[PDB]
């Protein structure tokens, strides 16, 4: 089964092609993770996935999405991740982390607590930042302040500091969150970036924040550990042909800047779109990025059945299959997949205290 | 769905009828649980089960099955369970514990490391105790030492101390392990109990260790928290009708002694048996014990599908359905069952960080 072949990238070897993509839990306090996260991540790692990318972790307080988001903006925040890193490794999985800045989508309620921008008189809310003073709209009406050049320098340094903290906490894989309408994606998109300086306008200028952030992180993140990014390559906004061509060109420049693998996603930069949700719908687009930019890729958004995952690997559309919600439903999804794909000794996808009994069940 | 109706026993209310029965993990060291157990129990509790009975926990070192078994024979051992109690409660489940003594089946290798008695030359092993100096046989050939009267008093006190520790660690449900061929079951069974003193021979004498242990635990375990036991009610040894009748009579005595619920199982006292493994096969026997002894019951051994579990409750064969191996496969099995049984807002069987997204 292709899904259960190992994968080597730099000094990291994953035991299979099942990756758990970053999934915010909204359970942190002042950026500090706790026993929610410890059990959540350790249990999924024991389930058999080869790579576990920890949820979007804010590089700065105002870069959280919500008051429940994890942060890594201080050394104390980084130290809180050490037991998570070590528990993932103890389970035989590889610990990664996505470092992030929510941009104009920040200062929002948890999804089950309204999912919308926090009211201005609520002490929990904060002023958001973005390339331009333009609101997302819909449930996120707050207008961000437009970043200064000093803000751009500061946020880049926050990404650098976060990457060095992640390295010292023991993460073996890093993902820069340049997708999903957050700060990096919003610098790239003409919908959200109306700047008139070196960071807006032309393709080079709109790419600049992302390329400079990557280059600054590349200095501090080790060459021997995968340096990855998540990027929304189209918006489903009626501009898909031109946006794909630009996004693929940016992927080529990411590769020239030392990126090892690209997590291919959707932009979600504005609400006025028509995303054609369906099983494995990103497969063909991820394959085009992989082939045209000549970089390994992962993707998500509907690959969460064993056969869909296997087919995407056999078609060389992906190098790793990211399976998110299925792992919230069943932390042992990798074992479920091993059974469904007929892996020999499938129960030994799990540790011995489970595997021994399930072999004979 | 009957499987998702709450259950009240004494002061405890379970959010549904799904119980996770005790399942040894073989991952402790010197009786002390660790990160293996912490994540294992917390994750299953978040999965939605209403009751989580922690694995057989030895009341004394020689009462472990293996060198990896949990213990509660000191106050430090009990404190190690506190974070497990807290995590189970934080998930909205109810924490229970099975306290145990493996008797002649003790001093064995872990199941994936041979599953057999540790050899006499191997310093990891220890001398085992039992009612009589007679081996289980098969893969457990070591002949135990027959307990002295002082040994019997000591083991009873160990059960008392274990129950007191479980109480003060915050467990809300206790289960005495009188099943599965271990010490308590082996006092009851004529196969293993050849004693000629007050603890063997007649029905009263064979029951005595179990009834005295229950009574001693009763003096320390709170009246307002369920006091339960697991007991093998037949062996499938060609003596089933007589063994069932006297096991049910003992259950009546347990009831009179304050037992709140009986986990009905098989004896496993000797290897020479013919157990008819199959889906929900214990249903009819559990129902007979429940009805004849007038005690609430749970059982296991093949109820691990949503429809089998639901059917057993609708038929009033069980009060709680114990689902073991399915929770090792999927620690969110209760959520899987809620979906299968058409529970409204089934995803909210899980906590919010999962439930919100799975609803959509
Ligand atoms: C609860 C939840 C939280 C998420 N948080 C993140 C995140 O922190 N960073 C990110 O890039 N994507 C995040 N996503 C998107 C997922 O990584 C993934 O792309 C999505 O769940 C689709 O994959 P699936 O169909 O296998 O669930 C999240 C998704 C969910 C359901
Ligand atoms: C790994 C494992 C460990 C077990 N440990 C215990 C135990 O500590 N105490 C006990 O009374 N039964 C124990 N059992 C028996 C189970 O509680 C249960 O009766 C059995 O798994 C059958 O239920 P199931 O068909 O739902 O798995 C164990 C079973 C398994 C698979
Ligand atoms: C809908 C696109 O946005 C996401 O997938 C997401 N959370 O839901 C994140 O990226 C959190 C950082
Ligand atoms: C300096 C080179 O940049 C370009 O010419 C360009 N657009 O202006 C593209 O590459 C389109 C993606
Ligand atoms: C023979 C059946 O015995 C069991 O089910 C069991 N473990 O497998 C225990 O009870 C451990 C205390």
From TrEMBL, chain A:
Keywords: Calcium, Flavoprotein, FMN, Metal-binding, NADP, Nucleotide-binding, Oxidoreductase. FMNH2 binds at residues 22, 24, 56, 98, 230, 301-302, 324-325. GO terms for molecular function: FMN binding; metal ion binding; NADP binding; NADPH dehydrogenase activity. Its cofactor is FMN. FMN binds at residues 22, 24, 56, 98, 230, 301-302, 324-325. The keyword ATP-binding does not apply. It comes from the Bacteria. Ca(2+) binds at residues 127, 143. Transmembrane segments: none annotated. Pfam families: Oxidored_FMN. NADPH binds at residues 24, 177, 180. SUPFAM superfamilies: FMN-linked oxidoreductases. Residues 3-340 form the NADH:flavin oxidoreductase/NADH oxidase N-terminal domain. PANTHER family: NADPH DEHYDROGENASE C23G7.10C-RELATED. This is Xenobiotic reductase. It comes from Pseudomonas putida (Arthrobacter siderocapsulatus). The gene is xenA.
């Amino acid at each position: 089964s292709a899904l259960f072949e190992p994968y080597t990238l730099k000094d990291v070897t994953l035991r299979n092609r099942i990756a758990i993509p970053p999934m915010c839990q909204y359970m942190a306090e002042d950026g500090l993770i706790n026993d929610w996260h410890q059990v959540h991540y350790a249990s999924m790692a024991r389930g058999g996935a080869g790579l576990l990318v920890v949820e979007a972790t804010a590089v700065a307080p105002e870069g959280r999405i919500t008051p429940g988001c994890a942060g890594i903006w201080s050394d104390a925040h980084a130290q809180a991740f050490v037991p998570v890193v070590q528990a993932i490794k103890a389970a035989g999985s590889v610990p990664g982390i996505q470092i992030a800045h929510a941009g104009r989508k920040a200062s929002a309620n948890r999804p089950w607590e309204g999912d919308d921008h926090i009211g201005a008189d609520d002490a929990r809310g904060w002023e958001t930042i973005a390339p331009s003073a333009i609101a997302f709209g819909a449930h996120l009406p707050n207008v961000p302040r437009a970043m200064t050049l000093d803000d751009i320098a500061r946020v880049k340094q926050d990404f650098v500091d976060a990457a060095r903290r992640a390295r010292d906490a023991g993460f073996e894989w890093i993902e820069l969150h340049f997708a999903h309408g957050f700060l990096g994606q919003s610098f790239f998109s003409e919908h959200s970036n109306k700047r008139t300086d070196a960071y807006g306008g032309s393709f080079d200028n709109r790419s600049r924040f992302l390329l400079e952030t990557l280059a600054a992180v590349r200095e501090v993140w080790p060459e021997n550990l995968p340096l990855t990014a998540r990027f929304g390559v189209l918006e489903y906004d009626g501009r898909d042909e031109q946006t794909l061509e630009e996004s693929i060109e940016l992927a080529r420049r990411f590769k020239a800047g030392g990126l090892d693998l690209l997590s291919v996603s959707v932009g979600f930069t504005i609400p006025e779109t028509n995303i054609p949700w369906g099983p494995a719908f990103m497969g063909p687009i991820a394959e085009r990025v992989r082939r045209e930019a000549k970089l390994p890729v992962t993707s998500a958004w509907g690959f969460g059945t064993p056969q869909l995952a296997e087919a995407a690997l056999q078609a060389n559309q992906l190098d790793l299959v990211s399976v998110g919600r299925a792992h919230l439903a069943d932390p042992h999804w990798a074992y479920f997949a091993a059974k469904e794909l007929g892996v020999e000794k499938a129960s030994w996808t799990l540790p011995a205290p489970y595997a021994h009994w399930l072999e004979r069940y």
